[PDB]
Design a protein around this motif. Structure first.
Motif, PDB file in Angstrom:
ATOM      1  N   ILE A  20       0.764  -1.029   0.077  1.00 31.36           N
ATOM      2  CA  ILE A  20      -0.032  -0.171   0.067  1.00 31.36           C
ATOM      3  C   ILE A  20       0.764   1.391  -0.140  1.00 31.36           C
ATOM      4  CG2 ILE A  20      -0.313   0.827   2.336  1.00 31.36           C
ATOM      5  CD1 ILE A  20      -3.070  -0.068  -0.280  1.00 31.36           C
ATOM      6  N   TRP A  21       2.132   1.245   0.341  1.00 31.85           N
ATOM      7  CA  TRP A  21       3.094   2.207   0.558  1.00 31.85           C
ATOM      8  C   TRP A  21       3.561   2.623  -0.927  1.00 31.85           C
ATOM      9  CZ3 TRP A  21       7.528   0.680  -1.871  1.00 31.85           C
ATOM     10  CH2 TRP A  21       7.777  -0.533  -1.629  1.00 31.85           C
ATOM     11  N   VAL A  22       2.995   2.619  -1.958  1.00 30.51           N
ATOM     12  CA  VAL A  22       3.270   2.811  -3.313  1.00 30.51           C
ATOM     13  C   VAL A  22       2.787   4.198  -3.613  1.00 30.51           C
ATOM     14  CG1 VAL A  22       3.568   0.369  -4.170  1.00 30.51           C
ATOM     15  CG2 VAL A  22       1.391   1.566  -4.097  1.00 30.51           C
ATOM     16  N   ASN A  23       2.443   4.903  -2.729  1.00 29.09           N
ATOM     17  CA  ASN A  23       1.789   6.363  -2.831  1.00 29.09           C
ATOM     18  C   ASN A  23       2.140   7.076  -1.610  1.00 29.09           C
ATOM     19  OD1 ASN A  23      -0.830   8.010  -2.015  1.00 29.09           O
ATOM     20  ND2 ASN A  23      -0.512   8.197  -4.453  1.00 29.09           N
ATOM     21  N   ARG A  24       1.589   6.666  -0.451  1.00 33.83           N
ATOM     22  CA  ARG A  24       2.037   7.240   0.901  1.00 33.83           C
ATOM     23  C   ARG A  24       3.038   6.345   1.709  1.00 33.83           C
ATOM     24  NH1 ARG A  24      -2.081   7.367   6.037  1.00 33.83           N
ATOM     25  NH2 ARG A  24      -0.606   7.732   7.547  1.00 33.83           N
ATOM     26  N   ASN A  25       4.015   6.988   2.128  1.00 35.60           N
ATOM     27  CA  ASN A  25       4.686   6.192   3.181  1.00 35.60           C
ATOM     28  C   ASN A  25       5.517   7.474   4.113  1.00 35.60           C
ATOM     29  OD1 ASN A  25       6.293   4.401   4.508  1.00 35.60           O
ATOM     30  ND2 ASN A  25       8.034   4.290   3.306  1.00 35.60           N
TER      31      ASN A  25
END
Length: 25
Positions: A20-25
């Motif tokens: 899911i961290w392919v946008n926000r991290n």
């Protein structure tokens, strides 16, 4: 997630195709 009969790249493929961290991290 079990990749031992499997390489590193192939493992990252099937096992990290839902990260899911392919946008926000």
């Amino acid at each position: 997630c079990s990749c031992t009969d499997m390489s590193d790249l192939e493992c990252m493929n099937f096992c990290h195709k839902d990260v899911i961290w392919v946008n926000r991290n």
